[PDB]
C-alpha cells in the first residue's frame, strides 16, 4: 500500500522519540502514518480510524480539526508570520497571550516567559531559581528537588529533573545538583506499608523531604518542582493531604515551588490549573500542551510575584537577562494560543472536563474495580489508568518482561482505541479530549475491557494468572 | 499612541528575552510592537519601515510576507495539524521533509531528528554523545570541547556549550563535562600574536586544542562543537587553515565532531552548508533557524552514519531510545520546511547568497577598510561585520561603557536599519535575508555609513578616538 510505502520511506530517514531505532530501520518494528482526524478520532494514511483517547500526548485538548485554530493562524500569517521577542520587542497575539495566561493562573503570578515546549520551559525555571538565589546572595542555594517518577522533559538538565530510568539510563543523567525524594504513589508504597492510610503515605513523604533538605543542608536547597498529578509517570492523583504536607515543608526552609503544569494546565482535571484543584500556591508555572491543544508548539513559564520582584533587582544590578530562544513569542503561537483558549472558554471545557471527567472516573470504577486483572482503577477528571496485577488484593506486580501494560494498549489499539502503554510499569492511561463526551466515555470504556479482558484471558491461558 | 499603550500592556505582562526586565516592566526602556513584512522590510505598529539587515536573527532567510508558506501550513492544518511522532509513527510532510534534508546535507548523513530550536538540538546531540560512548563501553569518554565565543544556544546544557559570559554568569554555568578551547578569532588574539599570520593563529588553535585534548587525557574526551563560522559570537569567518588543521586533531584523538549549522544552514554563506563551503566532515549536524526561515519553530539533529551504527546497537541492546518532545516533527512545522526549502531551489537563493553575499563583502571593504572608526571588516556569503576601534592599526578596543556598538546600533535604527550590536565586544553585525538584491545592499550600506559616521563625529569631538 501507499501506506507501507511511506513508512518504508520514513525507515531510512527519520530517527523518531522513543523509538527502538534498529528494529525500525531495519523493518522489523511497526509503523503508522497519520493524516486526518475530528473531534476525538484520529486517521491513518489508510483511513482507519481510532478513538484517540490519549488526545496525542496530553494535549489536542479541544480535539482535532479545529478550522477555528487554522483561520486564527493563517490571518496572523498574512499579517506577521515571525519577528523576534527579545529587547523589548513583541507582537499582539503574544501580548493578548500573557494577559488571558495572568487571568487564568490568578493573584500573585506577574510575567510570562515563552518557548516552544515544556522540556525548555523548565530549563527556564532552572536558568531562573539559579539566578535569583544569586541576585539575593545566596550562592550556595542551588539544589532542586524532584520526584522518582516525576516528568518534565527529555534534555540534559530537563531530563535530570525527570524521575523516570529511560530519561537517565544511557545519559549520565542526572546532572549535578538534582535530587529525587519519593513518588507521590500510594498504591506502590511498601509491602511494609500496606497498612498506612493515604494521609500517613503523605505524612511519610513529607518527612522524607525534610529529612533530605536536612541532609543536604537547607541552605543549599533552592526549589522543588512537582506535577500536581503524575502524568507519564503513571497518570496518579496525590494521596490525600500530600500537597498540604509537602508545602508545610518547603515554607519551613524557604524553598521554592515549581508547579509543573505542563498535563493540567488549562481544564484538564476540572480547573484552570491542577494548582488550583490540589490548593497549591506555586512561584513559578510550568505550561505547554493544552495551552494551544499541540497547534502550535508553545511553552511558557508563569513568574510569581516573588521571584519578579527579584529578577527585577537582579537586571538593576546586572543589566539585560542572558536568557532567549530565537522562536520566542512566536506570533503564529501566540495565535493558536489565544484561539484554543477561546475555545476553551466558550464551550466551558473546563467544566466538561469536570463533569464528564468524574463520569469516566465513575465508568472506569464500574467497569474495573473488581476485575481480576486490575490492581488500581486511579484518575481524576479527564486523567484515568488501569494498574494490572497478577493479584490484585495483593498489590502483586508482574514480571516486567510480560509486557503486560504494551499488550493491552496493542489489544485496545484493535478495538481502534489508543491508550498509552505508561512507562516503567504495567499501567494502560487514559487523557482524552476535553470535549469528549459521556457516550464517547462509554465506548472508550467498553473498548478497553475488551482488550483488557483479551488480555487477561491470554495470561490465563498461558500460567501466567 | 496606541502603539506605547501595547507596549505599555506588555511591561506588565511579558518577561522578553535579553531585556533589562527592570528597566522594561517600569517603562524606562523602550518596546516595540512589529506588525508587518514584506521582503526585507519589517514595519512596526505605527506603519515605520525598517530594512532588516539581522533577518530577524539569522533566521528569515526567504524573506517577511511569503503567502507561498502561509498557503502550505494552512492546507496542512485542514489535514492534520498534529499527532505525535514516537514510536514509529510519522506524518507525510514530515516523512518527506526528512528526506529533502538529507538530500542538502550529503552522503554520509544518515537520519534526522527533530526538534524546536537550534538550543534543543544541541540537548539532543548531548544525549547522543553520552548514549554512543556508554553504548561502546567508554563510560570515560564524555568531556565535550567548545570554544570561546561559540554560541550553541540559550539552556543549561545547550548554554554550558556556548562561550559567552551573558549565557553563563548569575547561572552557575557551565555545567561539568563541557569544555572550551580558543576562540576562531584572529583580530582577537593577544598582542604577543600580533606577528602570527592567519595560518599561523589556526595552527595555534589546533595546538591548543590537542593540549586541552592531551591534558584532559583523550580517552575522557567524547566530541568536539563549533560553528563554522562564528555567528552570535561576533560574524567571525574561520582564519586560513582553520577546518583543516583542527580535524586533523580530532582523528587523531578520536573525538566526534559536531557542526553547528543553525545560522549557516540552507543557503546562509552561499553553499548547502557552511560545512560544505568549508570541507568540513561532520559526524552531527544541528539545525533550525533557515530550516523554516521562521515560519514555524523546527529544529533538527542530523545524525552521520558512525553514530547512528551505534544507535541501532544500543537500541538493539537496550530497547527504544528514552528521548522525545511532545512536538516533535510537528505536520505544521514539517509543511513550513517543505515550503521553505522548495522556495530557496526555485528561486537560486544559496547561489544569490554565494553572489550577492559576494558583492555585500566588496561593497563593505570599500566602504569601510579604512574608516577611522572601523579595526575589522569581515563577512562571508550573506554574513558580515564591523568591529569598531579606537585605534584600528592597534587593534584596539574600546572600554565597553562607552557603548560604541549598541550606540551605532541605534544610530542605523534611526536611519530606519535594522543591524544588530553584537554581544562582548563592539560589532555591528549583518545577516540579511537572503533574497537581498545588490540595489539592496547598496542601501543598507549606505545607512550603515551614515549610522557609522554620526558615531564617529561623536566620539571625535568627545576625545574617545
Ligand atoms: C549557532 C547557533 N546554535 C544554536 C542556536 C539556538 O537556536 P535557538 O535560539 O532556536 O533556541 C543558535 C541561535 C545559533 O545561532
Redesign the pocket.
Known sequence: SQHQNLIDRDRKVTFHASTHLRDFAHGEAPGRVMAGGEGIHVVDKDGREFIDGFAGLYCVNIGYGRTEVAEAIHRQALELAYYHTYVGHSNEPQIQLSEKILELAGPGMSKVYYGMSGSDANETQLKIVRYYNNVLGRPQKKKVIARQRGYHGSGIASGSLTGLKAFHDHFDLPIEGILHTEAPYYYHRGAEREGMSEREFSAHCAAKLEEMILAEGPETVAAFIGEPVLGTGGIVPPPEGYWEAIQGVLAKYDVLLIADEVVCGFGRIGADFGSHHYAIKPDLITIAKGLTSAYQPLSGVIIGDRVWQVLEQGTGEFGPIGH????SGHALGCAAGLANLAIIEREGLTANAAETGAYLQQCMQQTFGEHPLVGEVRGVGMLAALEFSPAPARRAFFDPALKVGPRVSAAAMSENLIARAMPQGDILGFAPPLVTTRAEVDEIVARAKRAVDKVTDELTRSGDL
Open positions: 532567549g530562544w530565537t522562536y
